[PDB]
Design a protein around this nucleic acid. Structure first.
Ligand code: ZN
Lengths: 199, 108, 187, 147, 1012, 184
DNA sequence: GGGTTGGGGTTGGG
RNA sequence: CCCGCUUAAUUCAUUCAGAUCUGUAAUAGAACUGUCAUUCAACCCCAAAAAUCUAGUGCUGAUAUAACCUUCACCAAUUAGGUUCAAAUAAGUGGUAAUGCGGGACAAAAGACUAUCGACAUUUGAUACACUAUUUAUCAAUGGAUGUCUUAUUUU
């Protein structure tokens, strides 16, 4: 209706005033995320009291378009669907590989085991390749093929050579390796503390 | 430059010349080079052992002595891995001696 | 036992033949001047594929079998067989040409020949092929030469083909010349 | 212009008659029952160390009938030797300088030396009989083709 | 700078090629090697032969040929023997000029063909040269060197060395191609819609028989495991089953439906076919227009294809997003012009591989080697897309639609329903079987011709109010041993008729064939017009209607038999030519071979055994050059013979028993010669030249009987008669209409586009409809009858221009393709009527202005297609132009360099060499400024260029303006130095520069140029 | 190369020139003053020399020449011809590359010549101008030939083996018949 | 038992 | 503007050829079956350009009488107003796409996180595998990255 469209334009202007979108900042997301600050009318139908002015979505679309063409704070052209304002108004398992050809790069040994298909962390040093996992099931699921039952020998192919590996590291060495992962993981902590202290 | 003729003859014709420059060919006889023709063998002057090891066949240019002995002036050898035919060689020599073809090999 | 004939008799009995006649002879010739201005090979399937579907990207697919095939190279040369009487331009096909290529260089296999030639050519190594072919000049042989009085594009023409290429044996050629010359003097 | 097999004595007689009777046709072709330009011959090839001859390397072909003197050629862009003679040098160095018969095709024109186009080493005496018979046969063939 | 000069010596040009280490004439080479001495005597002929002959060598070999004093140079051999010994020395090497038309066997070389350059090797000059060298050095001079001997004012002939045409020449994967060209011209139509009965959807129909009919896809070499093969076979069986559940009738009715009054049109066409007596005419025009106004729009068939694919192929076969992208690109696939096409990469580079779910890997490289996995799966996705397109989209279009282009629309594409095209075919058969074609039974044709020549085919192009037939003779009879189409049989007679054509320019009529001849005639007429004092001019234009169907076979054969311009026996020689291109000499990076300068062209020619004055028997070629720049020719060993009797037989056949097929029913002409043959284009001009010569006697003397200039030109069809006396134009029209009445043809549409008006009653010309205009609009030209300056007519709207450009862009060699395309699109038509004799200075500037304004619009689609691919992902271009905004710099580079080359070529075309250099520089800068101004003003409004490229282009244009001003400002001082004396043209140039006030700005000139 | 010379259709040229010869001959000698007719028939003296036109310029390959009997032999694929030439100037004018034999010539102009011999006539062919255009060395094995220096037997030989030779021999016989019937 | 040499590209007049 | 789902019904017509049926005055109507084709489809003449394109600028000081910038669909043409070597607010024309439903709070100058990660995240160089317009991996270097809270109320 005429009074209905007038009240609709009045409420849309009262809720479109940048002071409201600054004290509440609700419509700020719709304003920013809009393509060119031209939001559509499909977000106006989700209002609470706007439906109370109802007393065929294109019909109400054209009604609001008329009530906006009679207004000046906002803008509407070509009877399009979107609407816009005429001002910016801004403001437990780990093992070890051994007998690796000395000097071989990290890439070969890490990919030969990444062939497993499951993640792991590897530390290489001249032969000793300490490998650890995050999941306990993957150990028993992988040893079924990495420990080749054809030979029943823990052997991996690297750079054209056979290399040995152990299925269990000592328990005291396991505790020391856990404490070493703590050392390096707490080393991150001391790094970051020094970075926070340099100023 | 200098024409040193050296015709070829059979074994019997060696007795017909009795001193002249000729060229005769033969196969080595295994035990003073000595070679068997064609069983009749002929003896010569070259050092029997001096020739190379692989060589099995020989051709000599020289003057024929009284009989069965010939001083060799030119010595040719080759590793003939195949049995040297003889009857065709005799036919060729006889045709060389033929009157219809004598005007090809030697003068007159 | 066979009966031989020189190149003159072949050229004669060829230029006095009506269309549709084929004939074979045996000659004590020798090969020379393997031509190289043509292409030195062609493609053929294993099942006597007449036409091979050509593709791009070196793709191949036969039609007499209708399976994806590994293309086979049959090399065909062209050279001249001559003698103390004449000369004849002949064509050499896969088997004979491979036999020759293998005799001059025993490393290459009788079935590896075409692939060797094609790889040398396409890679950019023709000098080696040129020298290899040059090493065959005046190589004595025993040939079985076939001639056919066919007709192409309604134009009569004589073509010579080589069937058997064997190593020579002077002991028999000598006897042949001797008997021929005996017959010649006797009459 | 076809190849003819003949021996050294025939070459000597032919060149002698050519140099003695210049009242022939004014063509480089010799005359022996026809106009021939090439020749085939099996003979005892041996080098002939001439004096200060850069391009040419004189040779010699002894035989059971006479003796001729041939000339070889060498590449101009590279002062080296052809293949068929390099192989002969190698083979002669191996056996320790023992001269062998060879079968040679050579081109002879008049009022010039006798070049040697190609030759191959022979290791079979049946080649000698083959060459003699070829000579006689082709001679008879040309003679009875003249009549 | 490195401008283009109009005169060059082959010795100078050869010095620039880096491969050749030593080049010189033969005389200096003989003085260097001491083979002769200036104190000796040599006749003039031999000394000139030693001075002009040029030799080249890839190595400095003057030392190896030094005179060895060991033995004097007395030669006893002939020349043939020395050359034979040289060819023997070559051995197995198979590319040498002295080796053409011969074969080496053993130690004997034999000649088997006609190398027309042997005359040069065995002449007396080469005999004396052999005497000078001696055999042992001649035999290697014929090998180590390249010997070009001058035989023509500028043309050289190569007689010895390596063939120059030998200097003009690990793998990767190559995706298949989508056979788009299959969709265009299909005249078939079945009872029920769908696809052909030979397609795999209908083959004897079990996945087994599908494997049987898809034996080309089930066993590709991209499927890793048999598992994948079976997995894909399942999808194909589901595709087939889904296809058999489509009712094409409802689909066609929904999107692309027949008109509302189709039954009316069917009845009208059936009625016109039935009536034996001739029907009306304008009704047929209205019916053709009502039929052609039923073409299916692009959106309609696009929706049709999307809808038929959506319910024929499973979604996951390609992936949820791959399928979406594919359906989106299908539109672009629909609306592309005739000779355009899409590449598989267009789809691939915008799709994702990890979206296809049913893929598998034998080794688990999805994490180790991700790139190799993406490659190995792209190699499968591409084949999937090619299969989909070339097995569903192509047959459906080819079967249900007829796709072709309109007469005037150019290269645009149009889709017609199948029934409507069958109606058009019926109506055209009716409208064509009454005038010239007629049905025929294979009884009447003689069997000798029937087994000798092949047949032809008919096509129909829709026209405004009628059709346009086309006869194509590409087919050949595989059976009966016919391995050549009819054009390949008539090639030799076409060569003879070209030889004839070279003599019809001035002997038996008024014919023209190319823009060079037209421009020469115009230059002469403009000279005479300026001589007489520029009086008023009149003109008249008219054209025969359907010439090729109006010529009488009897009169043509009679004119053929009794002509003396056609000899009895001709020999055909084939050779090849290296001519000079437009690259300026690179003043002296060190890798410059021949093709940087010379263009290779393989040519044939037919000469006569007579003692003709062209003496082709000595040279072997006939080239008419337009400048004094060298060119090389080498002959070839491929001669042929042709006889007037064979040409007579071919003419009689193609003029009497020419039978062409259509819809498997045969037709045969009744009068005229078939357009579509290579030979007809000259035959028509000859036949009409005879007739028009019979009736135009008064023009032969009307230049001196009363002192009146008058030009008369004619292409195969169009006349143009410019004159000074209206009476001559009236007499011309009268005589031409009289000849038309006498011989049986009539002029097209009775439209005479004259310049004056006159009472059409005093001459019985009432039936003509005179149209009066004030500018001669001849073939794509606008001759201005007040200044008689010529230029072309350009389209005005971006759509009209786009209708005739087929873009084809490949990432492989963009840099060359785009530059060549610009160079051509500039120099296409402008290069001929840029003659400084025809147009004045302002005329040339205006012509360049308008032509550039047209060519920029022509080029624009190439730029918009280039921007559709990002180059940063291509190392080949990112290493050279950067990683950010690389397209901008690439386009700027190609634009700049092509514009510079075009400016240099224009300066070459406008001036001579005697002109000062500063004038050339000023005009080069002026043309560069004009072109850059046009480009900048045309692009400154677009979007893809608005951001950053326009700044570069504006900078370049401002720089060119500044350089032009600076040259114009320094020319005054340089001339006032008085060291230089000016000819007349330089004074004209100065007058043009100072009048328009090019010191301050171009503002005074643009009004005189942009005015249309 | 064999086809290039084959396509020349030389026999058409020979037929046309023979036709022109006999036509002009019995056109120019219709006086029939029997005293002059007896005066004309003398042994070994040309009765009529007809030059050929400029359209009959065929080419061929020289296979063998003879300088004492001035004889030339040419060939083209199938057929070979035996003809004469006017003098040594004919050879020395055509710039031969190496030698008369084995070279491709074009005949700029030739001529027919009519002789009276024992009891009958004889029509020869004389080549008057040549030019060497190239060298070709390809022995052609011509099955059949025609000799213009042996009267009627020179042509009528091998007449059964080819239609063209049959027709030309027939025309030659008709020509000599008309010849002997006009004067005698 | 092989055989012009199959092309790539597609503007502007007729 | 982005993301997920969805978008429908009988035949608008049936050329050519073959075999059936129905009545007739020459037509018609019913219903059926086979189907691109010389294995291939592409019209011709003439004229213009031609690098194995990592190889190329006087890399550019000009005419505020100038050059840029400004519009809610998109693009391409027409008018208004500002700026001084670059930045933000417009108005008439012509063509092109348009079913509905649902989501679009970090906005940021930091503070707190000892939450995190030798499995953090960038940046570069090196090495692999790839390349016709690849969306990776390891090493080295480097320091910051992540998830939560505070400055915050659907008349939105
Ligand atoms: Zn097969």
């Amino acid at each position: 209706e005429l009074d209905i469209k007038e009240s609709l334009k009045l409420q849309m202007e009262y809720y479109f005033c940048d002071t409201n979108l600054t004290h509440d900042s609700y419509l700020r997301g719709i304003i920013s995320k809009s393509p060119k600050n031209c939001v559509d009318i499909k977000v106006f139908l989700k209002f609470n009291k706007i439906q109370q002015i109802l007393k065929s979505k294109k019909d109400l679309i054209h009604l609001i378009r008329d009530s906006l063409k009679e207004s000046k704070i906002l803008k509407v052209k070509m009877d399009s669907l979107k609407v816009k304002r005429r001002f910016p108004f801004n403001l437990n398992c780990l093992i070890k590989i051994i007998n690796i050809p000395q000097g071989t790069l990290k890439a070969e040994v890490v990919l030969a085991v990444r062939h497993l298909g499951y993640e792991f962390y590897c530390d290489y040093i001249d032969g000793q390749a300490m490998i650890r996992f995050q999941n306990s099931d993957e150990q028993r699921l992988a040893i079924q093929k990495l420990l080749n039952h054809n030979n029943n020998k823990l052997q991996i192919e690297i750079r054209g050579q056979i290399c040995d590996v152990i299925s269990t590291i000592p328990e005291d060495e396991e505790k020391n390796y856990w404490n070493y992962i703590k050392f390096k993981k707490n080393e991150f902590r001391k790094f970051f503390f020094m970075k926070k202290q340099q100023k | 430059q200098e024409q040193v003729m050296y015709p070829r003859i059979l074994f019997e014709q060696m007795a017909q010349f009795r001193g002249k420059k000729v060229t005769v060919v033969g196969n080595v006889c295994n035990e003073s080079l000595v070679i068997e023709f064609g069983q009749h063998v002929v003896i010569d002057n070259y050092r029997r052992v001096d020739l190379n090891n692989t060589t099995k066949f020989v051709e000599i240019r020289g003057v024929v002595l009284n009989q069965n002995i010939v001083s060799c002036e030119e010595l040719t050898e080759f590793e003939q891995k195949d049995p040297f035919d003889f009857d065709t060689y005799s036919k060729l020599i006889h045709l060389s001696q033929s009157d219809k073809l004598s005007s090809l090999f030697t003068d007159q | 036992q066979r009966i031989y004939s020189s190149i003159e008799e072949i050229i004669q009995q060829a230029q006095a033949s009506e269309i549709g006649q084929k004939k074979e002879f045996y000659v004590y010739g020798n090969l020379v001047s393997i031509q190289m201005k043509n292409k030195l090979y062609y493609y053929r399937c294993t099942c006597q594929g007449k036409s091979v579907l050509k593709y791009h990207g070196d793709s191949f697919f036969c039609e007499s079998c209708q399976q994806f095939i590994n293309p086979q190279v049959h090399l065909m040369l062209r050279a001249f067989v001559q003698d103390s009487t004449g000369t004849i331009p002949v064509m050499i096909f896969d088997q004979q040409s491979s036999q020759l290529i293998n005799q001059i260089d025993p490393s290459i296999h009788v079935q590896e020949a075409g692939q060797y030639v094609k790889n040398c050519i396409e890679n950019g190594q023709e000098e080696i092929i040129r020298q290899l072919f040059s090493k065959l000049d005046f190589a004595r042989f025993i040939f079985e030469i076939q001639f056919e009085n066919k007709e192409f594009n309604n134009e009569q023409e004589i073509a010579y083909k080589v069937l058997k290429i064997e190593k020579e044996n002077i002991k028999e050629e000598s006897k042949y010349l001797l008997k021929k010359l005996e017959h010649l003097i006797n009459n | 212009q076809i190849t003819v097999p003949l021996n050294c004595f025939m070459i000597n007689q032919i060149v002698k008659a050519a140099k003695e009777n210049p009242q022939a046709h004014s063509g480089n072709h010799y005359e022996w029952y026809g106009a021939f330009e090439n020749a085939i011959i099996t003979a005892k090839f041996e080098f002939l160390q001439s004096i200060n001859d850069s391009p040419k390397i004189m040779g010699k072909l002894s035989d059971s009938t006479g003796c001729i003197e041939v000339v070889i050629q060498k590449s101009k862009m590279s002062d080296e030797l052809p293949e068929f003679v390099q192989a002969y040098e190698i083979e002669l160095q191996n056996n320790g300088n023992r001269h062998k018969y060879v079968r040679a095709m050579l081109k002879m024109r008049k009022n010039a030396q006798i070049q040697l186009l190609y030759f191959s080493i022979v290791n079979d005496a049946n080649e000698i009989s083959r060459h003699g018979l070829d000579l006689c046969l082709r001679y008879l063939q040309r003679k009875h083709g003249i009549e | 700078k490195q401008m283009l000069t109009r005169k060059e010596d082959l010795l100078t040009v050869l010095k620039q090629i880096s491969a050749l280490k030593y080049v010189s004439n033969l005389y200096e080479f003989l003085l260097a090697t001491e083979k002769i001495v200036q104190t000796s005597e040599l006749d003039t002929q031999f000394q000139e032969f030693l001075t002009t002959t040029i030799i080249a060598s890839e190595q400095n070999l003057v030392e190896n040929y030094k005179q060895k004093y060991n033995q004097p140079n007395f030669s006893q051999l002939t020349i043939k023997q020395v050359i034979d010994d040289s060819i023997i020395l070559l051995g197995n090497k198979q590319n040498y000029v002295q080796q053409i038309g011969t074969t080496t066997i053993g130690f004997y070389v034999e000649y088997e063909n006609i190398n027309l350059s042997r005359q040069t090797l065995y002449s007396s000059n080469f005999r004396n040269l052999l005497n000078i060298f001696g055999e042992e050095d001649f035999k290697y001079f014929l090998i180590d060197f390249l010997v070009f001997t001058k035989v023509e004012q500028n043309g050289y002939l190569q007689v010895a060395g390596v063939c120059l045409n030998q200097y003009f020449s690990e793998n990767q994967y190559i995706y298949p191609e989508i056979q788009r060209s299959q969709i265009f011209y299909c005249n078939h139509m079945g009872r029920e819609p769908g696809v052909f009965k030979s397609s795999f959807f209908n083959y004897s129909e079990p996945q087994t028989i599908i494997k049987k009919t898809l034996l080309k896809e089930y066993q590709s070499k991209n499927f890793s495991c048999q598992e994948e093969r079976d997995l894909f076979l399942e999808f194909t069986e589901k595709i087939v089953q889904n296809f058999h559940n489509i009712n094409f009738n409802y689909l066609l009715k929904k999107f692309c439906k027949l008109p509302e009054n189709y039954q009316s049109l069917k009845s009208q066409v059936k009625q016109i076919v039935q009536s034996e007596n001739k029907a009306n005419q304008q009704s047929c025009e209205n019916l053709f227009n009502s039929l052609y106004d039923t073409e299916i729009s692009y959106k309609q068939i696009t929706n049709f294809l999307r809808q038929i694919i959506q319910n024929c192929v499973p979604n996951q076969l390609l992936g949820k997003k791959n399928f979406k992208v594919f359906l989106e690109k299908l539109y672009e696939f629909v609306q592309m012009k005739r000779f355009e096409n899409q590449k598989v990469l267009d789809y691939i580079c915008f799709m994702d591989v990890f979206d296809v779910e049913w893929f598998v890997d034998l080794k688990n490289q999805k994490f180790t080697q991700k790139r190799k996995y993406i490659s190995d799966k792209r190699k499968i996705l591409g084949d999937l897309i090619v299969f989909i397109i070339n097995k569903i989209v192509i047959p459906v279009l080819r079967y249900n639609f007829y796709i072709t282009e309109k007469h005037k629309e150019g290269s645009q594409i149009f889709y017609y329903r199948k029934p409507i095209w069958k109606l058009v075919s019926k109506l055209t058969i009716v409208k064509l079987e009454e005038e010239n074609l007629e049905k025929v039974e294979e009884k009447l044709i003689p069997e000798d011709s029937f087994q000798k020549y092949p047949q032809g085919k008919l096509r129909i192009i829709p026209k405004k109010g009628s059709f346009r037939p086309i006869m194509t003779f590409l087919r050949k009879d595989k059976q009966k041993n016919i391995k050549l189409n009819l054009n390949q049989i008539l090639m030799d007679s076409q060569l003879v008729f070209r030889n004839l054509k070279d003599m019809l320019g001035q002997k038996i009529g008024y014919s023209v064939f190319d823009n060079k001849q037209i421009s020469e005639k115009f230059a002469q007429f403009i000279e005479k017009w300026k001589n007489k004092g520029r009086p008023q001019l009149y003109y008249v234009t008219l054209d025969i209607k359907k010439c090729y169907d109006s010529i009488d076979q009897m009169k043509l054969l009679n004119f053929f038999n009794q002509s003396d311009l056609i000899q009895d026996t001709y020999f055909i020689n084939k050779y090849l030519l290296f001519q000079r291109n437009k690259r300026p000499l690179l003043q002296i990076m060190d890798n410059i071979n021949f093709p940087y300068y010379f263009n290779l062209k393989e040519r044939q020619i037919a000469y006569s055994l007579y003692d003709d004055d062209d003496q082709i028997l000595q040279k072997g070629f006939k080239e008419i050059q337009s400048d004094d720049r060298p060119f090389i020719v080498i002959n070839q060993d491929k001669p042929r013979c042709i006889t007037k009797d064979i040409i007579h037989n071919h003419l009689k056949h193609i003029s009497q028993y020419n039978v062409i097929s259509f819809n498997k029913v045969k037709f045969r002409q009744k009068r005229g010669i078939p357009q579509g043959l290579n030979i007809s284009g000259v035959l028509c001009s000859f036949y009409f030249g005879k007739l028009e010569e019979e009736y135009t006697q008064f023009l032969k003397n009307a230049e001196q009987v009363n002192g009146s200039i008058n030009l008369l030109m004619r292409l195969t069809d169009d006349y143009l008669f410019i004159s000074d006396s209206q009476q001559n134009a009236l007499n011309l029209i009268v005589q031409l209409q009289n000849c038309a009445n006498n011989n049986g043809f009539m002029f097209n549409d009775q439209k005479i586009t004259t310049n004056f008006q006159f009472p059409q009653e005093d001459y019985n010309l009432e039936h003509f409809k005179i149209s009066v205009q004030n500018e001669c609009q001849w073939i794509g030209k606008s001759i201005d009858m007040n200044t008689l300056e010529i230029k072309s007519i350009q389209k005005q709207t971006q759509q009209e221009i786009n209708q005739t450009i087929n873009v084809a862009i490949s990432i492989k060699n963009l840099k060359s393709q785009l530059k060549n395309k610009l160079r051509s699109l500039f120099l296409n038509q402008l290069i001929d009527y840029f003659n400084p004799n025809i147009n004045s200075f302002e005329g040339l500037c205006r012509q360049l202005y308008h032509h550039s304004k047209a060519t920029v619009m022509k080029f624009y689609p190439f730029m918009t297609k280039l921007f559709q691919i990002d180059l940063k992902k291509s190392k080949q271009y990112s290493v050279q132009y950067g990683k950010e905004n690389t397209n901008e710099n690439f386009l700027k580079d190609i634009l700049y360099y092509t514009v510079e080359d075009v400016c240099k070529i224009l300066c070459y075309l406008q001036f001579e060499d005697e002109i000062n250099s500063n004038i050339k520089e000023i005009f080069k800068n002026l043309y560069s400024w004009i072109m850059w101004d046009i480009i900048v003003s045309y692009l400154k409004k677009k979007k893809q260029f608005k951001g950053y490229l326009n700044k570069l282009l504006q900078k370049i244009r401002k720089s060119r303006f500044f350089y032009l001003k600076e040259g114009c400002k320094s020319l005054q001082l340089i001339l006032s130095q008085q060291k230089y004396q000016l000819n007349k043209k330089e004074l004209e140039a100065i007058e043009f520069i100072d009048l328009n006030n090019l010191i301050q700005d171009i503002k005074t000139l643009i009004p005189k140029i942009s005015a249309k | 190369m064999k086809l290039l010379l084959q396509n020349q259709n030389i026999f058409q040229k020979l037929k046309n020139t023979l036709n022109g010869c006999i036509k002009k001959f019995y056109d120019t000698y219709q006086d029939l003053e029997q005293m002059q007719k007896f005066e004309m028939i003398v042994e070994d003296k040309l009765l009529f020399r007809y030059s050929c036109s400029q359209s009959e310029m065929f080419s061929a390959q020289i296979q063998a020449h003879y300088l004492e009997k001035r004889v030339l032999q040419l060939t083209d694929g199938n057929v070979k011809y035996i003809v004469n030439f006017r003098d040594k100037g004919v050879l020395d004018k055509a710039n031969f590359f190496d030698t008369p034999n084995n070279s491709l010539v074009i005949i700029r102009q030739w001529s027919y010549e009519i002789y009276y011999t024992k009891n009958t006539f004889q029509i020869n062919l004389v080549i008057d101008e040549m030019r060497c255009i190239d060298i070709i060395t390809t022995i052609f094995y011509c099955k059949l030939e025609l000799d213009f220096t042996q009267g009627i037997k020179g042509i009528s030989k091998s007449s059964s083996f080819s239609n063209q030779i049959y027709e030309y021999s027939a025309q030659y016989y008709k020509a000599i018949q008309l010849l002997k019937k006009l004067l005698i």
